[PDB]
Amino acid sequence: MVKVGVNGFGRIGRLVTRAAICSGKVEIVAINDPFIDLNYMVYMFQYDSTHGKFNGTVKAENGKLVINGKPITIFQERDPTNIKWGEAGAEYVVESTGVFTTMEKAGAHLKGGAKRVIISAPSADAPMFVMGVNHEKYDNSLKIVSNASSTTNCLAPLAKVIHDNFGIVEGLMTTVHAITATQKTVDGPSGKLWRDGRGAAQNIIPASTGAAKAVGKVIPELNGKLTGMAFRVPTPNVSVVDLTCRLEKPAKYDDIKKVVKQASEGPLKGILGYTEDQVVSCDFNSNSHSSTFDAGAGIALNDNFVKLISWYDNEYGYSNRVVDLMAYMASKE
Amino acid sequence: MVKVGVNGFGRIGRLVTRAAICSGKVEIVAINDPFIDLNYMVYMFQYDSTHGKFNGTVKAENGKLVINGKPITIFQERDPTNIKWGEAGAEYVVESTGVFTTMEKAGAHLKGGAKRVIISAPSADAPMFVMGVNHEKYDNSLKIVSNASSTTNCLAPLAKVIHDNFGIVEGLMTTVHAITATQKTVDGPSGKLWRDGRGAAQNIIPASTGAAKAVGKVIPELNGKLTGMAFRVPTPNVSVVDLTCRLEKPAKYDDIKKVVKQASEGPLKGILGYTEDQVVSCDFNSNSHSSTFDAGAGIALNDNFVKLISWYDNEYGYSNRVVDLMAYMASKE
Amino acid sequence: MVKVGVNGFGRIGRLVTRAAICSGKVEIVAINDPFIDLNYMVYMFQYDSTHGKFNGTVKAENGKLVINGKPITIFQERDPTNIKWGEAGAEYVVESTGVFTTMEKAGAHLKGGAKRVIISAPSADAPMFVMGVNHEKYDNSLKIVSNASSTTNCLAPLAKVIHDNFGIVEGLMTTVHAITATQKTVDGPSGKLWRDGRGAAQNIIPASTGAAKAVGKVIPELNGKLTGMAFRVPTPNVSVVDLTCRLEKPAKYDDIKKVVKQASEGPLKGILGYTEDQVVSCDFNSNSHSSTFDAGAGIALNDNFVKLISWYDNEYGYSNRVVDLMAYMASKE
Amino acid sequence: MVKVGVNGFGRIGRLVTRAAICSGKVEIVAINDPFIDLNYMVYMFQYDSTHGKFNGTVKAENGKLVINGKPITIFQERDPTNIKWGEAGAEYVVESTGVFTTMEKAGAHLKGGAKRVIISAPSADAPMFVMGVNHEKYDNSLKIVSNASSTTNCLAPLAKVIHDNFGIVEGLMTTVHAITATQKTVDGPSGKLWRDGRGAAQNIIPASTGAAKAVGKVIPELNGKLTGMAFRVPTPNVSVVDLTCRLEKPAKYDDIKKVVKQASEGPLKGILGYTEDQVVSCDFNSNSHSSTFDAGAGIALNDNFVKLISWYDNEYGYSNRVVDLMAYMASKE
Ligand SMILES: NC(=O)c1ccc[n+]([C@@H]2O[C@H](COP(=O)([O-])OP(=O)(O)OC[C@H]3O[C@@H](n4cnc5c(N)ncnc54)[C@H](O)[C@@H]3O)[C@@H](O)[C@H]2O)c1
Ligand SMILES: NC(=O)c1ccc[n+]([C@@H]2O[C@H](COP(=O)([O-])OP(=O)(O)OC[C@H]3O[C@@H](n4cnc5c(N)ncnc54)[C@H](O)[C@@H]3O)[C@@H](O)[C@H]2O)c1
Ligand SMILES: NC(=O)c1ccc[n+]([C@@H]2O[C@H](COP(=O)([O-])OP(=O)(O)OC[C@H]3O[C@@H](n4cnc5c(N)ncnc54)[C@H](O)[C@@H]3O)[C@@H](O)[C@H]2O)c1
């Protein structure tokens, strides 16, 4: 089983740690975050406004973070080249600071002894993967990879099923997306474009989504045929993809539901979900799926033009996919 | 000025009264609401969480509501049949309770002496109108009419400009829509619309939009070619239309911007607006336009497939249009 | 266990059911709610925006609501005198509609064969109880009782400990209180509680609290020496009491902490909690305590004048006390 | 009009600018911010989620910010010591960044040619003034002064009136305070103030504040007799002071209302307001008062122990007092 270091103990860093504990699929052995000391990590891991108090034990002892009795080595390095991953036994590093998303920057972790780096965001040049969609294109020569974004992990499984069965001629999508840590509590200086500095709990905010440029990398057959944007809205977690697409082969809405349900029970089980219930965003809080198709909420204008809806816990579904990708990579070693 | 009675002194009834009173296009002379007594009406009209305190005077005197010195007769009838509109001199009645939206129910106001009724919502059977789109189809034999919905009033002027210039082959739309009075503060009963009962400020909620069935009636050439749905999100006011459509004639995005800007400066001035600024929803609070095209937020996938974004103050833009529709109707008497 | 019927399957009615299942202390055998039909009850019990999806099974079968394989009789009566509690085997009825809080109205359930009634709110005339404070004043003659309110259940255990140990000369309190079902999503009619109709997600709203008139009944030595009010603020659940009191015997703040912690570990265990952690409201979501003293948040002006802070899940803590009171009542039978 | 430079174009700097233009009591001639370029300043000043779009013109021309046709010199200096206030004609400098609140640090603006510095925040060592309470203690030898905090400006005028008439023996205050820029959209790192990092729109968050202690310094006779704390709650603006105090002379609540109303109509006009209306927080958005007594929300436990409630727009009331303090200082030159 692969031993993991986490760089950036944030929303994703902490929920990747929870997912690793919940799934047992990888082992966290080290965490680096210069803004959160050991005692502070006890607090921030234990209490979570969105996902609730951790169901387990967490304490600081002998300089280590001890979760369910397992000690974790804690680093406090602002410069990732200074992190002694090898000494702590960290083989794979989750790069979840938000600020080292290029090959050049994320590769810093290789200097301290990490064997592979998984960027928890889209990358300008690291190869990007979505479990269930193109993870089989990974190979042992890729020491630096990206798990794309949470919107990309919601859109791409749904797009793949629809394209495989009916053929997407062209499509546009929107994600109605929960607020995130890059946004501001009140109108202030942005960090990525003017609209994104505006007060997050007051506003619907048009914004970019990583899926716009990533989906065509993860599904080359849809490059130039699909893109989209986001509206950030005042919820703390859970987002929803709104995919409007023209199909090559005619598809009754019942056939769409049928093939999506079949996919959710077979090859994409645990990745793509399917529901007909009268769900709202909070019903997906702490749901580990990448994408849950909402059959009741979609619209078929005609046999070749449809709107398809799919929910995703942008924090916890993505965090579980990070764990899944590392487990997959390790099985390939 | 036509003399106006307001049935239902709610978000729309009060803001219709504000719009009328400030901009004397019509004269409010009577108000009925059995759940808001006279002294309570003073308070509810004076203070408004969303649009600020009324800039003017409001008081109770001699059993009438006096706004900027003009006395208004106050009724407290549950049954519209029993409201003495004629005795109060009300010629047109705004039917803004939300529960009398059919011809049969809204026509009760004629029994008390009203001459015409304007339903502030879509109607299963009353003829529907959107200022700037089909209001010249009104004729004087229509005693009961509908002003459609706020989403219809945002979508239809934009769809008209796009269809007139390039031809909409097919389209689907979403409105990211502020919470309204039909929603609930915490998970509660909602009759047969189960998602609408879930806690409004906690969730993104898929929902119907009145635009879905109304837009094909106000633009008959688009009937069956355009529909959509809503996501209710935790903001108190201001909504945004996201229109994805295929065009018959190819159009560069700059060509779309040019015809929309031209429409906003000509025949649709005051109804359809145009901006290139980096706006978010709060920038439209108390904006009286029906539809403001957001040039920067849209996406062209190719010359025949686009996503177009348009903002609307669902409370205040619609309330101004109710006033405008009545002023137009009165001008044709 | 005593067999229980629930009148009003709302926030309290549903979480009383969850608390009963979690505790095993009582058995829900019947539920009445004319606004939630059988199939709708499945949905509202299964999905909860605040407390998450039910961890168990729930389905409708042969006209019963079946939770964890146990069937519950469902009634749909507006008028409580028509509910056949006796025939369904419901011995105690939880009166959680919010509209039958007097002895005369709540006594309707005895006509259908219920043996006792527990009003889930303060009552103008039914005896009121707070577990840990005055529950031993209950006796078998009381067929109609009240469990007071969630703020009373948070304030009264803390005031009891303070008063027993140091003597409360006089005090006033505030609860910063989550929004509830009586509030409105946007400015609307509230009846005679005018501030309570203002938009709940937009506003800090001064309001009454049931603790103001209840606390002097559950702690008679403090009647006229202690009262308070509320500010409703835009959170969906969890509230906090802010108790400012003058003490007869001087006490250092750490002396106060010691006696509260000692109370929390002894006779008030599970009712009064104690923490020194840097908590916020979400850390108490789904917490079954009546009152958790926040040692770090409070402040002393001097040895005889202090401000004491205590958290409470107003939904789930109160619901657990409703179950606890019924179990105590049943042990007295 | 004294000519004013603004250091820092955060919320306070921008709203001081708006207050100055709206009131015409001073003339803004220069703004320094090293993080916000001139085109971005146009945008942040023009659009405001909380207070609405600026009602006037704002443009970038010739390297200056031109508001209502009057050009403003823009600087971008990291080091206040290098800002050329004198060349721009700025006589008073509003020091609003938060990081130069000591006399040694704020005095850096004197080296660039400014004559006086007004710190828009509490200061360890500069003299602090609350208009209406102790501004008469200003004198022309004072080159560096502080305008205290918003909460101190709300509590102090109320405490002055209550102490002048009845004598405050001791008091404890809570402020229920809107979200501010120091908070985080989702749980994130907050240095040594752990609770302040928790998701702002999700949580009621206890927080320390020196404001009550500080009014014991601006009103020396209350030194040692006041302290308090805060709860941060999910609203974007407007806060409320909750003062529980013991009085030396007995006072009926009607006596309290009378002397507060008298003060608000006389010497504290525009600073201390008085209402009996059924107000909520949004009713004070963009209200320029420092403190508005809420007569209906307070409680008299007895003639010597009361809870007094007073509202404040923590952004705009304070910004207007900064302008008023500068106008007062200039009148004594
Ligand atoms: N829904 C989501 O939040 C989500 C989902 C998928 C991917 N992502 C992406 O994951 C990444 C992290 O997102 P997040 O929401 O967890 O942000 P976050 O702000 O919650 O976490 C970032 C963490 O990195 C720490 N950090 C900052 N600089 C550091 C440095 N030099 N070295 C080590 N640690 C540092 C921070 O202290 C913080 O704890 C981003 O790339 C983001 O866009 C976010
Ligand atoms: N954004 C909006 O809020 C919006 C926009 C456009 C159209 N509309 C439509 O306007 C109508 C009212 O919407 P609203 O948002 O103002 O709702 P609201 O709940 O704020 O107002 C409804 C008013 O009707 C009163 N009322 C209820 N029953 C009545 C009766 N028998 N007789 C007289 N008055 C009665 C109520 O007391 C209330 O004041 C609905 O049809 C709605 O879909 C709403
Ligand atoms: N935090 C809280 O929510 C809280 C805490 C303690 C006590 N309480 C009190 O509990 C009671 C219910 O509060 P709630 O928050 O659960 O409100 P709610 O609106 O969520 O629940 C009320 C339920 O009663 C149903 N109902 C209405 N009329 C009925 C009738 N004639 N017969 C049967 N059922 C009917 C409604 O359909 C609804 O499902 C109130 O008295 C309340 O003040 C609430």
CA C258 – CA B20 distance, rounded (Å): 64
Residue of C33, C179, C203 lying closest to B186 (CB–CB): C179
- DSSP for A222-233 reads GTTTEEEEEEEE
CA C319 – CA C326 distance, rounded (Å): 11
List the structure tokens of A109: 């972790």
Q: What is the dihedral of CA D13, D15, D19, D22, to 10 degrees?
A: 120
Q: Do C170 and D301 touch (CB under 8 A)?
A: yes
- DSSP for A105-154 reads HHTHHHHTT-SEEEESS--SSS-B--TTTTGGG--TT-SEEE---HHHHH
Phi and psi angles of residue C183, each rounded to the nearest 5 degrees, phi first: -85, 175
List the structure tokens of A171: 């499509």
CA D81 – CA D83 distance, rounded (Å): 6
Pairing of strands A58-61, A64-67: antiparallel
Residue found by looking up tokens 């993505």 in the block = A318
CA B55 – CA C210 distance, rounded (Å): 36
Residue found by looking up tokens 């209200």 in the block = D287
C35 neighbourhood in chain B, CB within 8 Å: 189, 191
CA A238 – CA A316 distance, rounded (Å): 9
**Beta-bridge partner residues of C219:** none
Q: Which residue of D has its CA nearest to A36?
A: D189
Burial code (b: 16+ CB inside 10 Å, e: under 16) for D232-256 equals: bbbbbbbbbbbbbbbbeeebeeeeb
CA B272 – CA B130 distance, rounded (Å): 12
CA A84 – CA A82 distance, rounded (Å): 6
Residue of D170, D229, D297 lying closest to C299 (CB–CB): D229
CA B279 – CA A204 distance, rounded (Å): 10
Residue D63: exposure state from Cβ atoms within 10 A (0-12, 13-18, ≥19): exposed
Q: Of the residues A7, A9, A11, A32, which should be mutated to test ligand 1's pocket, given the most ligand atoms within 8 Å of the CB? A: A11
Q: Do A185 and D180 touch (CB under 8 A)?
A: yes
Pairing of strands B168-178, B144-146: unpaired
CA B93 – CA B101 distance, rounded (Å): 13
Within chain C, strands assigned E span 3-7, 27-32, 58-61, 64-67, 70-75, 92-95, 116-119, 144-146, 168-177, 205-207, 226-232, 239-247, 272-275, 291-294, 299-302, 305-312
CA C191 – CA B14 distance, rounded (Å): 17
CA A263 – CA C208 distance, rounded (Å): 54
Return the ∠ at Cα C292 (arms to C287 and C298), rounded to 5°.
Answer: 140
Q: Does B185 touch chain C (CB under 8 A)?
A: yes
Distances (CA, A) of B151 to B147, B231, B323, C36: 11, 12, 17, 30
Mapping DSSP to helix (H, G, I), strand (E, B) and coil, where does residue A322 land? helix
Q: Do A283 and C43 touch (CB under 8 A)?
A: no
Q: Do A47 and C279 touch (CB under 8 A)?
A: yes
Q: Is A290's C-beta closer than 6 angstroms to any atom of ligand 1?
A: no
Residues B186-190: contacts with CB under 8 Å, at least 24 apart: B186/C11, B186/C49, B186/C50, B186/C179, B186/C180, B186/C181, B186/C236, B186/C237, B187/C11, B187/C44, B187/C47, B187/C48, B187/C49, B187/C50, B188/C10, B188/C11, B188/C181, B189/C33, B189/C35, B189/C36, B189/C40, B189/C44
Q: Is A315's C-beta closer than 6 angstroms to any atom of ligand 1?
A: yes
Burial code (b: 16+ CB inside 10 Å, e: under 16) for A252-286 equals: eeeebbeebbebbeeebeebbbbbeebbbbbbbbb
C280 neighbourhood in chain A, CB within 8 Å: 47, 49
The residue whose CA is least distant from atom 40 of ligand 1 is A98
CB of B27 within 8 A of CB of B330?
Answer: no
Which residue type occupies C166?
A: F
Q: Which of C165, C122, C116, C128 is nearest to C266 (CA)?
A: C165
Q: What is the DSSP letter of D92?
A: E
Which residue type occupies C296?
A: G
CA B201 – CA B11 distance, rounded (Å): 18
Q: Please list the alpha-helical segments (H only) found in C108-149.
A: 108-111
Distances (CA, A) of B219 to A310, B156, B239, B273: 30, 7, 21, 20
Residue B298: how many other CB atoms lie within 10 Å: 21
Q: Which are the contacts of C1, defined by CB distance < 8 A and separation ≥ 6? A: C24, C25, C26, C27, C327, C330
Which residue type occupies C148?
A: A
Q: Positive or negative CA dihedral for A196, A197, A198, A200?
A: positive
Interface of B with C in 293-332 (CB under 8 A): none
Q: Kindly list the structural domains of chain C, giving each domain's residue range(s) and its CATH number in brackets, ordered by start.
A: 3-149+318-332 (3.40.50.720), 150-317 (3.30.360.10)
Q: Is B199's C-beta closer than 6 angstroms to any atom of ligand 2?
A: no
Residue D138: how many other CB atoms lie within 10 Å: 15
Q: Which of A313, A185, A162, A181 is nearest to A245 (CA)?
A: A162
List the structure tokens of C274: 């104690």
| E strand or H helix at C63 | none
Mapping DSSP to helix (H, G, I), strand (E, B) and coil, where does residue D9 land? coil
Return the percent helix, strand and coil in chain D, to nearest 5: 35, 25, 40
Q: Which of B264, B256, B308 is nearest to B290 (CA)?
A: B264
Binding-site residues, ligand 3, Cβ < 6 A: B 188-189; C 7-13, 32-36, 78, 96-99, 120-121, 149-150, 180-181, 314-315, 318
Q: Which of D181, D182, D226, D177 is nearest to D206 (CA)?
A: D177
CA D96 – CA D99 distance, rounded (Å): 8
CA B189 – CA B195 distance, rounded (Å): 10
CB of B35 within 8 A of CB of B10?
Answer: no
CA B129 – CA B133 distance, rounded (Å): 8
Nearest ligand 3 atom, CA C13: 16
Q: Which of B33, B37, B40, B49 to mutate to test the interface with C (most CBs of C within 10 A)?
A: B49
Q: How far, in Å, from the CA of A99 to the mean position of ligand 3?
A: 49
CB of D325 within 8 A of CB of D145?
Answer: yes
CA C183 – CA C197 distance, rounded (Å): 6
Interface of D with A in 88-117 (CB under 8 A): none
CA C31 – CA C89 distance, rounded (Å): 11
Residue D111: exposure state from Cβ atoms within 10 A (0-12, 13-18, ≥19): middle
Q: Which of C100, C219, A237, A299 is nearest to D185 (CA)?
A: A237
CA D205 – CA D196 distance, rounded (Å): 7
**Beta-bridge partner residues of B145:** B118
Residue B131: how many other CB atoms lie within 10 Å: 24
Distances (CA, A) of A170 to A167, C12, D138, D211, D256: 9, 49, 70, 59, 70
Chains that touch D (3 or more CB pairs under 8 A): A, B, C
Which residue type occupies A262?
A: Q
D181 neighbourhood in chain A, CB within 8 Å: 184-186, 188
CB of C172 within 8 A of CB of D301?
Answer: yes
Give the resolution in Å.
2.0
CA distance B51 to chain C (A): 11
Which residue type occupies B328?
A: Y
Residue B225: how many other CB atoms lie within 10 Å: 21
Q: What method did the depositors use to determine the structure?
A: X-ray
Within chain D, strands assigned E span 3-7, 27-32, 58-61, 64-67, 70-75, 92-95, 116-119, 144-146, 168-177, 205-208, 226-232, 239-247, 272-275, 291-294, 299-302, 305-312
List the structure tokens of D196: 């302040």
